[PDB]
Amino acid sequence: TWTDDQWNAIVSTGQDILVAAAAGSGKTAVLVERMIRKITAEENPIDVDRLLVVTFTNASAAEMKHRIAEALEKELVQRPGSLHIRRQLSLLNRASISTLHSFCLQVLKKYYYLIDLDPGFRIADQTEGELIGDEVLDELFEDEYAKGEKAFFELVDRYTTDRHDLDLQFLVKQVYEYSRSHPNPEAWLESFVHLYDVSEKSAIEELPFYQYVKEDIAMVLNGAKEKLLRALELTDNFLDDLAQIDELIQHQDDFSELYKRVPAVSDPALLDEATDLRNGAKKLLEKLKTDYFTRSPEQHLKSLAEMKPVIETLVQLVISYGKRFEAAKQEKSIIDFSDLEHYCLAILTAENDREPSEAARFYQEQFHEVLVDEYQDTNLVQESILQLVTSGPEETGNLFMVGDVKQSIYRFRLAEPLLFLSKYKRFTESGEGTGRKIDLNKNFRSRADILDSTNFLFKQLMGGKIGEVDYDEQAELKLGAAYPDNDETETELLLIDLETVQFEAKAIAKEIRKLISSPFKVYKKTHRNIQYRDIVILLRSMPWAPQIMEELRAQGIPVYANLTSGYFEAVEVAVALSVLKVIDNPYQDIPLASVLRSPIVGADENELSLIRLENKKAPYYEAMKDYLAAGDRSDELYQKLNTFYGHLQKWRAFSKNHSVSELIWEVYRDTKYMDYVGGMPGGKQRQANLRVLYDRARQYESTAFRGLFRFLRFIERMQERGDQEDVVRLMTIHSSKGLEFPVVFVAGLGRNFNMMDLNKSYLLDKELGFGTKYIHPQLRISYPTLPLIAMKKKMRRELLSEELRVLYVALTRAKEKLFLIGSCKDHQKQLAKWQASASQTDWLLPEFDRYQARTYLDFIGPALARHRHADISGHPARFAVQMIHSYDSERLEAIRRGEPVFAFDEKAREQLSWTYPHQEVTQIRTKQSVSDEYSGRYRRPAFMMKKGLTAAEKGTAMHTVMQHIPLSHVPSIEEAEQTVHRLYEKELLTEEQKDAIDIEEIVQFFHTEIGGQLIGAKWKDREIPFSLALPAKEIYPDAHEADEPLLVQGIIDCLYETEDGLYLLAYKSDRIEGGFEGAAPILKKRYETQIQLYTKAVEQIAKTKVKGCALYFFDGGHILTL
């Protein structure tokens, strides 16, 4: 069965539909069912190709195709005689089920000629793409420095940490990358200045950015009052402070008035804690003063209007960059992933004087409906692409989108969930003349306590400006699971208060084994213990991954986290690169030593120093050779070196005729480094690291770069900048997604969020555009600009909403059990801070205190306190808190030298001594010609060479004629010429070949005894091809072992039969006269072996016999018999 909501999503049509699908909604299943209906139904079925389904991975697309299959055959068995359904089964491979990028590509390949894009264009990976960026960038900057424009230096001096210019080009990249998130990048870039164009005559409360200043001031002022009011409840001074504040609240609207007021006017337990709530006022009111009111509204205006010239210079720079960047790609027929979407948008839009081009008209026709998953993570460009292929205005139309804003965790990639959310507010639950929206609340996948815990937390957290979304019913998760009633399913929180991670990782490890030893069996299925693989520990970041992993392996099962970088500081990698470096340029002291001290060579520290002693001034490379040359052979250190120096020269030569990936593999097999590395701690990961180096070289040979040198820099660039088994899976929350686990640990909750984004002298924003500090290079003074502060106030509450959703995906990835591990210093006092926040009724915590949030803890803690004010505490959620003080043999030794002392003892020894019985033949060529690419046996350019022929070519010509001469009778000199000419006419002979023929030497043969015998014959044939099978050794005496037959293939020039027997005839253009008496013996055995093969070929194959063989020679017209 289905839900009414799922039913709605499945069958609803006639307009755009937005499906808000909560975690475990079974959206996938309903998505499949929907298409299945339209495709396989009685009324009016449609083909799969008439649908457009976009997924965020090709894997999910592929999985989409499989279910669509599964159900198709099912519907096919029930309707065995359906021609249409069987056809659909064939369309799944041609159908459009893919990522948007995968679609864009299909579009570019089809309509490439509409823009300027090379077919067979190549998509560069994000690495080389940026490598090309740095390149064109350096070119641009150099040009600007050299051009000496005044404005440019003003920009440089201003944004560069002078003594250094690096910081500037990052800003340019940063800005450029941002603009690409817009349907019209350049326009948006020129939109920058519009903000900086003001006057002291301007209304601040009017312009765009003040919207966030207004709201900021509101919160703080109110947060002050509400923070003071309690001080009043605690029980004259608070009133003087309060009355003043209310006074400020009266003028919240007037920024100019605030500049007048704000700056100027502004039990031992409950007694000393009430002074803190008063200090709160001061602190809040003081930060408010410094932020906005330290300098006049008029001063802020002038400051901004002075920056305009700079902003303009900066903009045109980014634009010039983009142009050069695009040009560089074009040269190399290259596009980015950005280009993929923009070139698609270019094709879909043909604007003249905005027109949905003919290309778009095609897709609007083809696609009866379009389905988009994970819609909350859509960008503006994609959306404008979607609206471009979707046919019809919103009220009608075929746009179908599913997702959940609450699960939007990728805003740092510039995805805009407001797009999804703006439609959700614009759409009605019914479909009356508008977009139909549908909610999927039922979670068929998770246990009750989870949904209750997750629902209880975010009810008090997600909302307003910090949630961006109102948390309510039709939003709250609902129980659909049939999980049997069992306990110990209560959500746990373990508060523990460099070693931080240690105390936190231990605690986690503990209750894990508490789950292992104890049963806690996970579940018409059956119960089963924890396999370790059913428990997962989610971190928000991965600085702790390596540490946590360690001790969680120190006791019990190992830990598997999917590590990203730290790859270049990995020892294996360092050494491997060190080897490649020495192969490139042996003269590198450090890289050379790196290899010599690695297990690859294994030189002692004394041995290393012993080497230097030979030559103290020369590079370490020469010091090494100097040791070799003079050294003695029975020397161990010498043996280590000579072996290495041997490999080096091999690798050196190997690389110049092979690729980098090949050179790498060869080095791995020559040194057995990859094998060796698999035999040491964490060797499994080490081997992988070592083979991703190989794969990266593979990726590298498809790039616009080549050679070993470049590869080194390539990898060097990656450095300088960016870089079934049962086990605890340690991974980031962001990587969880549709993944799920019976038991989930979410740790590091007592740690700060990353706000580093809000530090620098500038910020980028979709709406407000560019924002920066006021900077005067000559006066050496700078300070935050009003837009800058506004952009930070906004960005802080948008970053915070994102984190709350990151925490929302974490708790929802749980099936049965949830563990929350946080950390701090003083337990009680924070619970007192938590108490302070937990007072206000209405469920949704104070909008300001949630704003002040820093650690995940500050979200949970207070939202948790009130629990264990009727429904709040009474809410069916189970929590378990724990306050933690945070303080509480022979075989190896045999292996170390010799061997130990089994069931397979006998088999193993045989297989290692085994050889291939027929191995001697495995290298021998099957077909061997005697004169097709399957057989075996200083040229100058024709334009720079002689005007004539070579002995070879002449001979080839001389040969052709003999084989075309009529054998009816003896030709005369002219009868021969006629033939030669006809061969010329029919193009069996080149003009050169024709003029090269010596007719006398051609007619001469037919006057010989042999010639006349050829003429007179019962039967004749020429140019006779043959294939003879011989035992392999009969040709190769070297390999005697195997008797397999090989094919010798050639052409017998001539054969003729008389009343005597069959005779063989061959013509040879061999050089003779320069007597022939003395050449005969030599010629005889130059063609000796060849003629025997012929006779053999004839005698063995024809089962007849060849009596006599003759060879005619054009030089003097000579004949010898064999």
Partner: protein, 90 residues
């Protein structure tokens, strides 16, 4: 060698293109045309045959037909100009 020739033809005759005028520039367009001509020969379609087809779609209003004929037209130019430089001596 055919592509080299083609790149020469796609130069001069470029401005007679109804569709690929912009795509003629690109070096990956020569290989695409080279492949199309091969197919034309293998399937016994002479330049005269393509010209013929090109004006079968000319002036019959189904967009996609019009475009198709326009590309068949450009190909026709290169096709018949290739056969003209390969005539009798290649």
């Amino acid at each position: 060698g055919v592509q080299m020739l083609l790149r020469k033809l796609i130069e001069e005759h470029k401005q007679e293109f109804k569709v690929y005028q912009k795509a003629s520039d690109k070096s990956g367009f020569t290989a695409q045309v080279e492949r199309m001509l091969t197919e034309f020969k293998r399937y016994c379609l002479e330049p005269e045959d393509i010209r013929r087809m090109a004006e079968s779609g000319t002036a019959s209003e189904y967009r996609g037909e019009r475009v198709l004929s326009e590309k068949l037209h450009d190909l026709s130019i290169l096709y018949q100009q290739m056969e003209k430089s390969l005539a009798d001596q290649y």
